[PDB]
Design a protein around this ligand. Structure first.
Ligand code: HEM
Ligand code: HEM
Lengths: 145, 145
């Protein structure tokens, strides 16, 4: 269950998430757009899913892309704030899962975000340990897909 | 025009938003759910739009309502964090406007949240001055619908 995946995140994983989020979450516009543009660069097959945003190659200049990317960073803020209450984490993960289920995004496709997260973290010198912690949070969402 | 509406957020208004958000934003779960249950109690005719959340009369005990409500408070957080930059505020407002346009929510119906906001504010000892500041931020969204 989602709860199981949630309930599993340990004190050390939560620490590494919070520590790296302090940095990555401090520039939501810049890091959110880098996350999205990295997804599109590395996984070109996903571009079609984002047709509402218009020409995503425009980066920061594309207002729809910038609004989406900032907002995505607040979904991660939300998850980070809920880490200590699995019950609250589960209900917000289930809400965002629905946003993706309705777009036909599978658990495997959702996991394509791990590559972009690892690259953004690495840009701030957070290494593999940090990328592994983030994959475990992503895995909570995958449990709902 | 969203841009004209955004221009109405003067220095004084911004300060009153930030000062009151310091208090209401500190309990996203509790204040989020209070806002929604106040909406539903005072404006019963809007309940039908929220079919996906199930039995909203259950309040905090309804997991879907709790997840939705927490998330709504992060939309507000997002707006407050964008007050420094009007181009960023506008692009996040337009993102959320689309979420409501697709649900067939008009500017007038969206404005039904002003009553609930005033009540939640008043419950924390923030009076009309603060409710009016909040109505100016809601008006930015209304301009986009
Ligand atoms: C860290 C991981 C992710 C988070 C936190 C996240 C969060 C979000 C949020 C907050 C939205 C807006 C939902 C709405 O307003 O309806 C969204 C939309 C969307 N997401 Fe994600 N997402 C993630 C990863 C992905 C991945 C990996 C894909 C596809 C492979 C994906 C596909 C979509 C699509 C197609 C939309 C709708 C875009 C639009 O038309 O507005 N997401 N996501
Ligand atoms: C301060 C004002 C409000 C804010 C910040 C806000 C924010 C949000 C957000 C962030 C969502 C989730 C969007 C998604 O995942 O698709 C949402 C959904 C929704 N909102 Fe609002 N909202 C506000 C007021 C209203 C009002 C007054 C109404 C109706 C009169 C309304 C109707 C809806 C509906 C029907 C949904 C979809 C619920 C569901 O099926 O998940 N909103 N809103």
């Amino acid at each position: 269950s989602v709860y199981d995946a949630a309930a599993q995140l340990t004190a050390d994983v939560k620490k590494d998430l919070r520590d790296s989020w302090k940095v990555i979450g401090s520039d939501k516009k810049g890091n959110g757009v880098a996350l999205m543009t990295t997804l599109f660069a590395d996984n070109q097959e996903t571009i079609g899913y984002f047709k509402r945003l218009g020409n995503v190659s425009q980066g920061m200049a594309n207002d729809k892309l910038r609004g989406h990317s900032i907002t995505l960073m607040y979904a991660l803020q939300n998850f980070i704030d809920q880490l200590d209450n699995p019950d609250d984490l589960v209900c917000v993960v289930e809400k965002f899962a629905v946003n993706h289920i309705t777009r036909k995004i599978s658990a495997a496709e959702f996991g394509k975000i791990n590559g972009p997260i690892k690259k953004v973290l690495a840009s701030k010198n957070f290494g593999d340990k940090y990328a592994n912690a983030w994959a475990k949070l992503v895995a909570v969402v995958q449990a709902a897909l």
